[PDB]
Amino acid sequence: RGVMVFPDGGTYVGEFVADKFEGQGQYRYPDGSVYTGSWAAGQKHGPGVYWDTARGCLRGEWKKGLLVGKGTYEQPALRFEGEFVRGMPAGTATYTLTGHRTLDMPCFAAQHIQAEEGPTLALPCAYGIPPGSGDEPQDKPPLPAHPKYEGLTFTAEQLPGAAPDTVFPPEEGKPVPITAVPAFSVSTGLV
Amino acid sequence: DPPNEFEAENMLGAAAVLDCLGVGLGRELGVNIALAAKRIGEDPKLAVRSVRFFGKFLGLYSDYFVFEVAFKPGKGANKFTYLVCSSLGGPLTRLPDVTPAQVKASRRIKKLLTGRLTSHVSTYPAFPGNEANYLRALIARISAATVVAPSDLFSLNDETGELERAEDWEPPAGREMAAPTAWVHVRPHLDLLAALEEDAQLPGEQAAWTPIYSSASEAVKTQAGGLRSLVWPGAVCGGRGSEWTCVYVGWGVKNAPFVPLPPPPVAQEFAWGEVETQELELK
Amino acid sequence: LEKTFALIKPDAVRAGKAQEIMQLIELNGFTIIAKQKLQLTRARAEEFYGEHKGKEFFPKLVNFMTSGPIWALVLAKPGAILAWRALMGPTNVFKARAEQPKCLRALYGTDGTQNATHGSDSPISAAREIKFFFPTLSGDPTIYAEPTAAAEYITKRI
Amino acid sequence: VQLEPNITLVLKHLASCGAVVSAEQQAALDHSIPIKRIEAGLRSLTLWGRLTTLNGKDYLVAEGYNVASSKEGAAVYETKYFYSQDGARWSDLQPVDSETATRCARIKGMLSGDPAKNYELEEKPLVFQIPELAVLRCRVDAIATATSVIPTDSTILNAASQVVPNRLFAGAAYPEKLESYQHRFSLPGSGVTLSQDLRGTWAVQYDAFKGVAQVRSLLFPGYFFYYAANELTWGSLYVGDGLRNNDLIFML
């Protein structure tokens, strides 16, 4: 067990093995984002929950620092469940979105007024990455960096369908380790 | 009280040109729009210098008629003020001033207007304002790209930094106005009087402006010409004889490959090579 | 067939939701035998709730049930009395909003008196309400055709 | 109760929605529609829509039919389509095979405006050449099977089991609700309306004073329908490049 504070202002509370993070640990970054999860050899490894500055939680299973494999991302009226390759989404995914802007405006059909199901949708989709990239280093095109995401494509060519209503924050994230996180439902809207 | 003076364009002629080209809102709404712009421009409590009709935005529960006024911070992209209404003749509402933050933040999303100004916009890609600010950002982005004028009609006045409507300007034949080398931008790019021919081409060496004609036969002698925007569907410019006009009618959505925003980056940690436990020598 | 007496109260009328309420009433298998949009006076609103002359909240209500125009309806369905009340839901708007979030009063009510609806509760009361509001609709001449009570009603008429 | 949509009323009511046609094309239609309707032997023929092209010669598309019959629980209209690029001379818009339907569904972008052009697709490398009129027909078929809006209970079934106008139709009780409208291919009395569609793919604006409802498709932006309740008329029109809106979940 250990508690550590770094010169940049980042802190860690958790477990160490041979001078590095290992096992359960909560890291608080200088920006205000909190990663509560599993570490190995001093980097994220295994299942963890990452609340980011944008007040959205990213779950999944990191491997050598990067979120790899099936990962979900959440915001009040949004959920993205998809593949991740070296932290970047690439491959099959599903976007689940609720219409929050018009929850108090009158409905177009009198069937929806009294229906016990909300106005949520769900779209199968896919993200796309340049071919040469996505490999593991040991030329090839570079990965999509943050500001531009140059090379990242997105394809969706099916219809959406109905879906169960979402809630925020997800109980897989509680207890919430940051502040100013809203709360969303359909009987209450955005709060 | 005496009605104040104001300058404008020939709006009935604009309705006629648009109808001849097959775009716009018709000619009954052209009359209604001209009378509404009159009721705006001739208002004492609102000392307006010039009125113009920007276009119409379609929403889910209502729509937006948008007028652009000049009023006798005040430069760049806030040179004009914008008043919107749901129905022509109804009470107007001034839109706020645009800030580069909300322009940049709306450039990342793609939404349908709800027709109510006091409504939220986005949750994940956070838009700082409400619907009114999103509408103002849309207006700014569309004005920067679509509002144009015939070439050689205006010139750049160096000192005053404004535009001089020359009065020896002669229009070409209507069917020659349907070229992209016959119009120029009259709004700052968000240099100034650059021809529409030098725009960003669409994927495939495709020009960003496509012609529209008034008649299917090249032998009719008095026909209109114009261009339609590919990037902003619903933005049209067009001239017949000596009259011409630009307008936007549509939903507000761009025409570009939309990539939703990925989840934001995750922060790294401190480098271990500079934080490592020391030790004293061994026996 | 069961006939019940309904009511759309001025708060729902002012909000522009009487048409939605009637459309939902008919989406739920009911059939509006009759509809009317009137304005209730003071003395008639008294006599309508005349069984609550000693109740405390009576003036608070009667001043609300004259605050605007109302919609009087006559609904009909197999087993209409209780289905209508299952539609209107609980009388406390907040109780209803807690229990049935998709109920009628849980969508168009705001207060313990601004619930937007008023159904009947018993067939006796339903018949009395309907005869009070729509004195033209004939209600069960079959039952009232008692061969003995008719002579007594003749004595009454003379 | 109307017997057939009137192009004048359609262009008048849907002009606010930007669904307009050129003046020359308007006159040319006023002459050309009856000629083609007679010389094709059709009972009904109307302007279906207008698809924009890259060279300025938009395709006007007209749809006609003779009789609609109930088959397998669907009100089938044996429709026939025609196209034009000036509004005066109508040519046939021939159906497309099912195998080619997928390929033309894969072709996107604004049409070229040259009926002799053909696009190319590549598969496992076998290349197919798809004529432009095939793409046009496929886009029209998709938009048609998606919208085809009429009011509810405006049609009725007759003794020969054919779908005919309900001449005693009184009007939609609640014109601002999606229950008042339905697809054309839904049988009368089947209870299937536009409210059974995917929630959020339709918008309705109702001017309760003049009595004019406008139903806009959000899945195919460009399809407009109008219903006037004081005169009991209605009609629809498509204007646009013909591509479906796949980003709808992110735009609502």
Curated annotation (Swiss-Prot), chain A:
Where on the tree of life does the source sit, at the highest rank? Eukaryota
* Residue ranges of MORN repeats: 12-34, 35-51, 60-74, 80-96
Q: Which compartment or compartments is the protein found in?
A: Cytoplasm, Cytoskeleton, Flagellum axoneme
Keyword Cytoplasm attributed: yes
The UniProt keyword set, sorted, is: Cell projection, Cilium, Cytoplasm, Cytoskeleton, Flagellum, Methylation, Repeat
The Gene Ontology CC terms held by the record are: cytoplasm; cytoskeleton; membrane; motile cilium
Provide the record's note on post-translational modification.
Probably methylated by PRMT1.
Q: Region (Disordered): which ranges? A: 128-147
What this protein is reported to do is described as:
Flagellar radial spokes contribute to the regulation of dynein arm activity and thus the pattern of flagellar bending. They consist of a thin stalk, which is attached to the a subfiber of the outer doublet microtubule, and a bulbous head, which is attached to the stalk and appears to interact with the projections from the central pair of microtubules.
Q: Quote the protein name from its UniProt record.
A: Flagellar radial spoke protein 1
Q: What species was this sequence derived from?
A: Chlamydomonas reinhardtii
Query: What is the primary gene name for this protein?
Result: RSP1
Q: Which span of the parent protein is shown here?
A: 612 to 813 of 814
From Swiss-Prot, chain B:
Q: Which residues of the full protein are shown?
A: 104 to 451 of 465
Q: Which family does it belong to?
A: Belongs to the flagellar radial spoke RSP4/6 family.
What name has this protein been given in UniProt? Flagellar radial spoke protein 4
Q: Which GO terms describe its cellular component?
A: motile cilium; radial spoke; radial spoke head
Q: Which gene encodes it?
A: RSP4
Biological process per Gene Ontology, one example term: cilium movement involved in cell motility
Describe the task this protein carries out: Flagellar radial spokes contribute to the regulation of dynein arm activity and thus the pattern of flagellar bending. They consist of a thin stalk, which is attached to the a subfiber of the outer doublet microtubule, and a bulbous head, which is attached to the stalk and appears to interact with the projections from the central pair of microtubules.
Where in or outside the cell it occurs: the entry states: Cytoplasm, Cytoskeleton, Flagellum axoneme
Q: How does it assemble?
A: The radial spoke head is made of five different polypeptides (RSP1, RSP4, RSP6, RSP9, and RSP10).
> Keywords in UniProt for this one?
Cell projection, Cilium, Cilium biogenesis/degradation, Cytoplasm, Cytoskeleton, Flagellum
